[PDB]
Structure 1
C-alpha cells in the first residue's frame, strides 16, 4: 500500500516500442573525434558541470561551441551523449556536432552548433507580450519533440534556453539532467532547479513523467508575464512547496497527495497549514499588466496544476489559444 502508480498520459511506451539500444545508454560506445580539429577561441561562460568555449573547426573554418565536461561518472556522460544523439535534428534542440577529449585533462569535450551565449534569462527585461508567446511556442516545440523521443529534460529554466534574438532562434540546452521515460520506473527527485521543481519532486513522488517539464515551463511563464523572478521563490525545498501553496491554495495540494496516497512528513503538514487559492490576477500590477491576457492566465492555470496527470501536454499547450496569433508569425528579423 505504498503510493499509487502513475504512467504518463502521452508518449507512454515510446521507449518500449524502440530497440533496447535507443535508451540503454550505459551500453553506448562513444566514437572519439579529432581533437586537433577544434581550437578554442574564447571562454563563453560556465556552469556547475562544464566550461563552455567558442571554438573553430579548422578543416573548414566553421564556428562552433565546445562544452568541456568536468570529471564525473561515465554513466552520466553516456546518458547526456546518447540523449543528444537521439534528439539531433529535432526542432530547437541544441545540435551535438562531435565529441572529443580535452588535450590535457582527457575529459570529454562536446562540440555543439554555435549559438549566441545570450539566453532567455537575459531577455526578461525587454520582451513584448508577442515575443513571450513566440518564444514560449519555440520552447514547446523542443519539449514536444523531446517528450515524443522518450526523453524528460528535468531542468527547464531560463538559464537553459539560449536565444539568438537577432535571428529569432531558440535552442534548448543542458541535457545533463535529462532522462529516458519508462512507465513504472522511479526517478531521483534531485533534478532541476529549486524554483522550477514540480510538486511531485517536492513530495518525493518518484514515478513522475514528462509533465515535470510542463510545470517548469509554467513557472518560467509566470515569472515572465508577472515580472517576478522567480515566481515561486522558495528558500529551501519545503518552502518551495509552501510558496506554491500560498498561490495555488492547499485544498488541491491535499487532494493531490490523497490522490496518489503520498506520505508527507506530519511535521511538514503542520507547516503548510491552509492557504486559499489566489486568483492569478493578484500578481497583476501596472508594471506588468500589458503581459497579462485572459488566455495567458488560462494557459498558466492549465500548466500550474499540482496533479502532474492534469497538466497540459506540450502538444495540447501548442493548441492553446495563448498561441493562436503567434503561430501565424511572418518571420520578420527586422
Structure 2
C-alpha cells in the first residue's frame, strides 16, 4: 500500500499541544448576542454558508456575517476552533463573534469587516510589484497557520479578500481547514478544482501544509502569466492532465512511484506522454512585464508534483522574488 509521508516542517506541532487545541469536537462555543448584528446586504451564498454585510449596532461597525448552512456538527466546531486558534495571526480573517441565528437555527460567524472585493476581482490587473507584494502577504498567513498546525486546504483567489486601496489582505473561509497530525489520512475532496494539488488528484491522503503551497503556485502562475486559471481542467481527471501537460508525465510517474501509488486506470486513455515544459513558453507580450527569472524560479519551486519537494511557506518568503518588495 502507499508509502507514508510527513510534513517536512511543523511536523509535530499538534502532538505536543494540549488536547484542547486540536480536539475541536470537545470545544465549547461561547455565544455572543445575536441582537448586536443587523444584516444589511446578502453578499454571497456557497455550499456551506450565506454571507452578509451586517452592522454591529453596539459600535456602529460594519461586519461580515456568515450564517452556516446545516452540514455536520463537527465541521462547525472545527472551523470555529481553527478561527479562534488563528485569531490575531498575520492576514488571518478575525472572527469577532459567534451567535445563534434565530431563523436558520445555526451558528452565524461574525468577522471583521473586509472590503467586498475578492482577490480574483483584481489579481489579473496588478503590477509586477503588486503581485510580489500580495503574494508575500499571503505567505505570511500561510506560514502562520502552518506553524500553528493547520492547513487551509482551500487556497484560491476567492478566499483572499483584498482591500487594494489600503494594501491589505485577509485569508478567509477556514471551513475546509484542518489540523495536521503526522501520519493522519485526510479527505482528498478539498480545495477547488483548479487549485487542487496533485496529491488530491491521485488520491494520496497523507498530505500536509504543502497542499496549500501548490494552490499558491497555481495563483502565482495565473497572475504572472495572466491566464485564469492556469491549469484549466474540465473535471478532476483532466485537471491532472492539464498539470501533466506542463510538468510532464515522467515526473508524474516518478511522484506516484515514490509513494507507491497507482493512478486511477481511467488515466490510461487520457494521460498521454508529455515532456516537462520550460516556464518561458507561457510568456508573451501581454504578460512579459510580470515575469522575471526570479518569478519563474519561484513558481518552479512551488509547482512540484512531490508535495515534499515544494517550497514551504517560510522558504518561499526567503525567495529572491521577494527581494524587491519593501518589508515593514
Output the TM-score relative to the length of structure 2. Answer: 0.98
Shift of 1:47: 2.1
Q: Moved runs in structure 1, 4+ residues, more than 3 A?
A: none
Shift of 1:101: 1.3
Q: Which runs of 5+ in 1 are unaligned?
A: 330-334
Q: Is the 8 A contact 2:82 2:174 kept in 1?
A: yes
Greater displacement, 316-325 / 270-279: 270-279
Shift of 1:145: 0.1
Shift of 1:251: 1.0
Shift of 1:106: 1.6
Greater displacement, 258-267 / 219-228: 258-267
In structure 1, distance between residues paired with 2:268 and 2:148: 38
Greater displacement, 162-171 / 269-278: 269-278
For the residue of structure 2 that corresponds to 1:176, the secondary structure is helix
For the residue of structure 2 that corresponds to 1:187, the secondary structure is coil
1:26 is the counterpart of 2:25: yes
Shift of 1:45: 2.4
In structure 1, distance between residues paired with 2:309 and 2:326: 24
Shift of 1:265: 2.7
For the residue of structure 1 that corresponds to 2:270, the secondary structure is helix
Shift of 1:57: 1.6
Shift of 1:21: 1.1
Shift of 1:281: 0.6
For the residue of structure 2 that corresponds to 1:326, the secondary structure is coil
CA 1:106 to 1:247, structure 2 compared with 1: closer, same or farther past 3 Å? same
In structure 2, distance between residues paired with 1:293 and 1:179: 35
In structure 1, distance between residues paired with 2:212 and 2:79: 17
Deviations 1:147-206 (A, max 9, x none): 000000000000000000010000000101000000000001000001100100011000
In structure 2, distance between residues paired with 1:60 and 1:246: 53
For the residue of structure 2 that corresponds to 1:272, the secondary structure is coil
For the residue of structure 2 that corresponds to 1:110, the secondary structure is strand
In structure 2, distance between residues paired with 1:244 and 1:219: 10
Deviations 1:57-93 (A, max 9, x none): 2222222111111111110000000000000010001
Greater displacement, 57-66 / 168-177: 57-66
Greater displacement, 275-284 / 53-62: 53-62
Shift of 1:274: 1.2
In structure 2, distance between residues paired with 1:66 and 1:271: 44
Greater displacement, 99-108 / 229-238: 99-108
Deviations 1:195-225 (A, max 9, x none): 1001000110000000000000000000111
For the residue of structure 1 that corresponds to 2:176, the secondary structure is coil
Output the TM-score relative to the length of structure 1. Answer: 0.96
Deviations 1:109-144 (A, max 9, x none): 100000011011000232000000000000000000
Greater displacement, 32-41 / 147-156: 32-41
Shift of 1:246: 0.4
Shift of 1:270: 4.3
In the alignment, what sits opposite 1:236?
A: 235
In the alignment, what sits opposite 1:108?
A: 107
Greater displacement, 35-44 / 234-243: 35-44
CA 1:94 to 1:289, structure 2 compared with 1: closer, same or farther past 3 Å? same
For the residue of structure 2 that corresponds to 1:97, the secondary structure is strand
Q: Is the 8 A contact 2:90 2:140 kept in 1?
A: yes
Shift of 1:267: 4.2
- Report the number of matched residues: 328
In structure 2, distance between residues paired with 1:267 and 1:304: 24
Q: Is the 8 A contact 2:202 2:264 kept in 1?
A: no
Greater displacement, 264-273 / 276-285: 264-273
In structure 1, distance between residues paired with 2:179 and 2:129: 33
| CA RMSD in angstroms, aligned pairs only | 1.1
Q: Is the 8 A contact 2:248 2:275 kept in 1?
A: yes
